[PDB]
């Protein structure tokens, strides 16, 4: 060819001058009688103005640029032989960019197992090709080169050497300058990340249910680093982690005594080990280990009562002995069975052992001391006294001022205290059915409590029987039965109403009580309407206390329909419609 | 040179103590070694505990003041690390021992830890062949009995810095 | 007799190899050169104790030297030995009388060197064995050194006492224990306490390469390769070295390999095709060799196609265009093409010298395509190469199918309102996605005037304001190819209100038996139409195109559901594309009950009769064809008269049913009736199901 371009690699940072050369041969020269004057330089296969060009010598001519921004600038240099017939002779590609700046966050990282690893961030884009090497020596030896395959991480190839001070930094090169980042000095031993532990074991306690030993193993590099434990337990049904004081975990230790605990309990458990001086990396979190309480004896005895049906004139009564099983939170175990003693204060114990909820016994006119206690795998529960007195007491002591109501979707139900003291409170209560038999729910409540609610699965519209008897020391109380609904209802059919007699201008209205079943609520009134073929609505409202309304302002030879609806607290529901003749 | 080994006087004696009790332990070269050479019969241990090299005493280390006491330990690190550049150019097998590399970069670190400790006293410290083997018994004998004075003097070394540190004057 | 007597010159040995070099001539000899053996007499510790005798038999020449080797087990340094030959002539043709000749001197061998009253010496030092093999070592102590006893790692030693310095232990069958070797150490038990011995080096057997075979690539290089075996390489400097030698036979080249169990071989040009080849695996110990025999053509492994581009020279059409590394003319690869779309897989065979194109044929339109080519050699097939996937997508092309068009003309405002319906086209039908459809009406008075209208997607209604001139319409599909074929239709001078017969048909559950009358005999084909007769909603017009020469066509749809009347259009279309309006039929798929009574309304009350009537019912918004009346009167006193059936009640009453035969007559008087009386009566109509639902009975008074 005719030669070559001067600088052959421009590289210029945005934002200055440049000026480049094509020198031509003197055999292209004499061969094509081309000088440098007919030279037309091209940029991305464009024109260039002729301001910019300038020619120098016979063989060179020199071009300028000033504040270049295309990143990827095509420059050739080509001759217009005769003829307007455009030679190319040379072409080259200049590149625009800046120079680096300093990196900084010189940081590393010692993984347990594998060599170092250190990070920096780069900064600013350059737009060119830059390579980052890391460097690393002693204060009397030197390692090998780091150079970044890709990215900014680089993992050294030489074993860690630990108790020996280290210094390392990186140095940022292009095809514009080289920039080094500051060293830094430190420890390998001081940026160890070590692993999880793992094995770990959670074990029970038979002596103390309330404790839970655990146990691990760490690595600790074959036991060069003293390791302090984070130990988080929690229960399996919350998703919060409850830590413990970090200032009891800072001993080098493979075990732990958690305290405080719930009896017959399941736990979860993670750990993560540090090195003592507090330095280094927190590793990750171990596997999660499970482990159950042991269990323990009973806090609270089960709730206890008694039935006893009518039987007259015979020497022994018949009594059904009830009593509910304890939740998984007061049994502190699986219940295995109820024990039971009876004695009429002056004879021997009779024991029974009953695995059900009911035990049915043949008792006699006296008064018995009754005693009832779950027994757990560990021990017996505490002695719940209950005596039964003779068929022949009355009460004296009844409770007063017994009130319902319904609140948050709960049956409140508030009551006043006997002046007498009483041991424990018992609240009974059941549906109303006229067509078949309710079932008996109970529950027991203590001397304190005047007010609470009903603990069951109740259903709406429904009228429930409530019942409350007070326990006192020598026998039960006055029993009292009042009425209460939890979401009262229009009914589902309106009453039945008849004429018991007509007569010339008057007429009584008869009708029928709506069921317990039917009723859906408390009823208020009753509200009666009637009107004739041509005749105006005329309604009138009776109090349900009445059954029998004579109704006046009846004209005689004319017919009359008639119809009665029941409104409740939740509006109302009409009824079946009926006509009847006057005379 | 000033590239390291920071003016900080009580981590370097701390790091010094750690590296003497870690090499000072015979689980370290001379048991593997024994165990590879099948050389655990009771008879190859009491011919190994015979056959002893002439290392400094503790009595004479703990005579000496610190400065010569710094450049005997220099003097015979280096003499330790040309006996097992010499095992390692007559054994004739990298893979299988790496507590050889593990030793020799150990005592590069003492070397270096001890040269610092040095410089930072403004003390300078004191600045200075066949292949093949005719037998394999004596060589083995040799070896073992320079593993045992090794460790000897290691753990010699490591009370010496004990009562240093100590000492504290 | 002639005295061949052999006379010893020198003797030397060798104890590293523990062997014995004798060299001896005869002065005795006349001839130049004749047949001789040389009984050999070997002792031990003295003269007397013959140990090895053998015979020695070659020719020896004039003035030529005799040179014999001897080896001895146990080492030469321990014990001296005496050694004595004579010759013997095999002249088998002259005097024959072979007699021996005198036995020449006892030249002493004798190679102990030496030993110090206070040390102790121990031969053989360190001795490479073979796992299985026997060794003698001797031992040899000083005066003061008693009771020597050597032993094993861990076991005792029972050594014999050759004489009375020296002792030997004999080893047999010896074991591998460590690469290592087993260190034998002996203690003195008086004199000097110390430990002296040698290691016992014992090395593995070395193995026969197994599976040794090889492959070419690309006609250079031959990758080779085996299987090792056992490693018998020794830690010290005894052993150390492995090497495996593979030499060709026709070019004579080998050179040690750089691994253990592969190599790379470069074969020189010259378009040789044979081989021979003698792999060789070789210790200090022993040396294994294995040959193997094979063909550079018949193990080709050809690797990736390359160059691989394809084209697109239609919808249906494309070109499959790759290259591969051929080394000659004659070597022709038979490749495998695979074409596969969706689930359906296309394979075929092609046979290729360097480059060649598939021409690939019906290709769907609008379909990705994946190709899968592979190649391997034609006559000698060794293995297949790799899988070249290349995906590409095919364009569109413009429809192919004519659409099926309909029409529904009234009147209204005075003009013939025309509402054009299409239905959607098919995916295979389309062969693209449709864009807008073309809308060209042409006016038969005026073809110059002619209007365009567009309908874009997917639009499938539209409305024309047309007069009572006849237009011609034209009706196709634009995607962003081309045109569709259009289908043709014209107008009439037909108001739509044509006059014919009505027919009802009984309609199946899911077909309806439509049948129509020709009343041309020159005819296109027909089309029948129908909607869905309800209250508050607009019918879809579906239509399906027929045959001339067909006249009954079972209809089926899932939208048919009984209690609603179709009321269908069967239309001709003539040789003009005109369609004509030629018979109407409607009809239920399955007829129900009714759903409404008509309201009552007493006209005049007798005290003896009364009459009944009601309006008109809705013949067209039922759900089925009325046939008549059932009303059913309730009283306390009256008898049901002929031709009223009676039917009693429970409830002490009288029931009478009257069927109305014809759902035309709507007024019907009943008699035999009694004044001041009381009377209910309820009306309701009835289908082929069923009567209508049991309404109240109307209250009703006569005086
Ligand atoms: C060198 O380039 C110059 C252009 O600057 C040219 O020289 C001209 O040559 C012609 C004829 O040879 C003369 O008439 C002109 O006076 C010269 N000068 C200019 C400015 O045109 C030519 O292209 C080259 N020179 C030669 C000798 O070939
Ligand atoms: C005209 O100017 C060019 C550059 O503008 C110069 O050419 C140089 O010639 C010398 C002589 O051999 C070379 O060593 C240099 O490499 C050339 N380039 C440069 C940039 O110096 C020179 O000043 C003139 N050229 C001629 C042929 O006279
Ligand atoms: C070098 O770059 C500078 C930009 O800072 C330019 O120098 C001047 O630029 C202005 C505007 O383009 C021109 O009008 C002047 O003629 C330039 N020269 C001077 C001396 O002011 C220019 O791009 C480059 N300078 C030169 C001398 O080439
Ligand atoms: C300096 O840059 C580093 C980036 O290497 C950052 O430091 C940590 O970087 C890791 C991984 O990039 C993050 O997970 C951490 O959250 C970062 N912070 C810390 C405190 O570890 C960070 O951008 C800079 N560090 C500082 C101390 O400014
Ligand atoms: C009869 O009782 C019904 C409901 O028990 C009453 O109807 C409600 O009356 C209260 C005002 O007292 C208002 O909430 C509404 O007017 C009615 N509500 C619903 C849900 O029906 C009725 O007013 C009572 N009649 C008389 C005469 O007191
Ligand atoms: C001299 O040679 C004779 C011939 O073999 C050997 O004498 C044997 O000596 C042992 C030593 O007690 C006897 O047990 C044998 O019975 C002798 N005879 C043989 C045939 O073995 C021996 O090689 C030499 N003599 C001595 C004393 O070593
Ligand atoms: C090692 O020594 C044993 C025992 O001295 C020898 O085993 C002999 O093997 C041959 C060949 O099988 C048998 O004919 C002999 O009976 C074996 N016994 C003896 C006493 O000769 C043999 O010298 C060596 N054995 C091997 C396996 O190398
Ligand atoms: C096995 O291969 C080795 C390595 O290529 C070679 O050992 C050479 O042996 C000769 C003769 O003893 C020496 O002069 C050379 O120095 C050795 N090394 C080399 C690289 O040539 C030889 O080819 C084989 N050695 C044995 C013992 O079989
Ligand atoms: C093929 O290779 C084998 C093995 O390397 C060789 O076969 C030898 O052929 C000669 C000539 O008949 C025999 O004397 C040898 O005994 C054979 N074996 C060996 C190991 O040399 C020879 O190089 C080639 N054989 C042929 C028939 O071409
Ligand atoms: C090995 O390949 C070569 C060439 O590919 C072939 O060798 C032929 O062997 C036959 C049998 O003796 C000869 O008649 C031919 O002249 C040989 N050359 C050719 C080009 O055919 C053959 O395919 C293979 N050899 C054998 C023995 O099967
Ligand atoms: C695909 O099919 C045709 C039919 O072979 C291809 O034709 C090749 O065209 C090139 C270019 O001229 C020739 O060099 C080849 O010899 C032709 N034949 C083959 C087998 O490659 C062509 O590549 C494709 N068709 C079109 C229209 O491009
Ligand atoms: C950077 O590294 C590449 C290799 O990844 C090398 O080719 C190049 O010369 C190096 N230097 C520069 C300035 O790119
Ligand atoms: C940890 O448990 C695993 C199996 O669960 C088993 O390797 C061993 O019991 C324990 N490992 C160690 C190193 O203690
Ligand atoms: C309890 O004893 C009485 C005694 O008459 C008798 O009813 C029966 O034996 C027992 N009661 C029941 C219900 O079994
Ligand atoms: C004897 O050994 C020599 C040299 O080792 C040599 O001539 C050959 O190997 C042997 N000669 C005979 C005749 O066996
Ligand atoms: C040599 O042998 C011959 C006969 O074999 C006989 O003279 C005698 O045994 C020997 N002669 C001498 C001089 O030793
Ligand atoms: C073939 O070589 C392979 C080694 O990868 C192995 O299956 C075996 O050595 C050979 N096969 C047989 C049947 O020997
Ligand atoms: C190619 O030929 C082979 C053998 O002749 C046979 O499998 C078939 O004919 C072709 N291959 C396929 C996949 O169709």
Redesign the pocket.
Known sequence: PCGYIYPEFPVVQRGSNFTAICVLKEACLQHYYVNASYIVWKTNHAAVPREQVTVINRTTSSVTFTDVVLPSVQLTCNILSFGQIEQNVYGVTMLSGFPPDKPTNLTCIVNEGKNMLCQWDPGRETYLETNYTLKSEWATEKFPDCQSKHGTSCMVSYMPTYYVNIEVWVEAENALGKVSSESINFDPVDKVKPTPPYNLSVTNSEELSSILKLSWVSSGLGGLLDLKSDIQYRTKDASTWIQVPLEDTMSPRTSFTVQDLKPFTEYVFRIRSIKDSGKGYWSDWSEEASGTTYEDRPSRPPSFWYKTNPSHGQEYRSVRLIWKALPLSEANGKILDYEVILTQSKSVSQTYTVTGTELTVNLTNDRYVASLAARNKVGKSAAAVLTIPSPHVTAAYSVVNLKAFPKDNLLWVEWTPPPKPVSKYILEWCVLSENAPCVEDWQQEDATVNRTHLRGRLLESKCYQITVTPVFATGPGGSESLKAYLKQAAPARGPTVRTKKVGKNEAVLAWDQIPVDDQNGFIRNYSISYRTSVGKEMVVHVDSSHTEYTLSSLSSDTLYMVRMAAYTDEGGKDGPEFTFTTP | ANRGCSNSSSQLLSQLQNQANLTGNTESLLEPYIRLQNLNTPDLRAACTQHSVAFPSEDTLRQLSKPHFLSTVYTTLDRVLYQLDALRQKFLKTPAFPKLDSARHNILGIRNNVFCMARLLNHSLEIPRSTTTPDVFNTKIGSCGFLWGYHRFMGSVGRVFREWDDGST | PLPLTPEIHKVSFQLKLQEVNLEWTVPALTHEELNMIFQIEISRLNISNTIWVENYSTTVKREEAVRWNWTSDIPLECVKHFIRIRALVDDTKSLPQSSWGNWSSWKEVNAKVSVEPDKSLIFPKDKVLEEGSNVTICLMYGQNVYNVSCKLQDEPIHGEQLDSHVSLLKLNNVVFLSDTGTNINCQATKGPKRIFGTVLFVSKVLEEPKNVSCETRDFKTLDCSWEPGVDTTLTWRKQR?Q?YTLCESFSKRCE?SNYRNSYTWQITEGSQEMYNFTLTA???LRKRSVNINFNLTHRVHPKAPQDVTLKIIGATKANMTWKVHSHGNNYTLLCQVKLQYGEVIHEHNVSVHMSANYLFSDLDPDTKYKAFVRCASANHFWKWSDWTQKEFSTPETAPSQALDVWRQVWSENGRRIVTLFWKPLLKSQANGKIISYNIVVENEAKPTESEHYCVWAPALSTNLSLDLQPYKIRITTNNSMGASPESLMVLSNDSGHEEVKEKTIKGIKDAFNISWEPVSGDTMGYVVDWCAHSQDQRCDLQWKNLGPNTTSTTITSDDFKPGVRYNFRIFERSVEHKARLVEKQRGYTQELAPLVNPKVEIPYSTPNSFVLRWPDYDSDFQAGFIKGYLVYVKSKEMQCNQPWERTLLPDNSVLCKYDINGSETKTLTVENLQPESLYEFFVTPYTSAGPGPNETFTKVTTP
């Open positions: 070295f090497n040690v070789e210790n200090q």
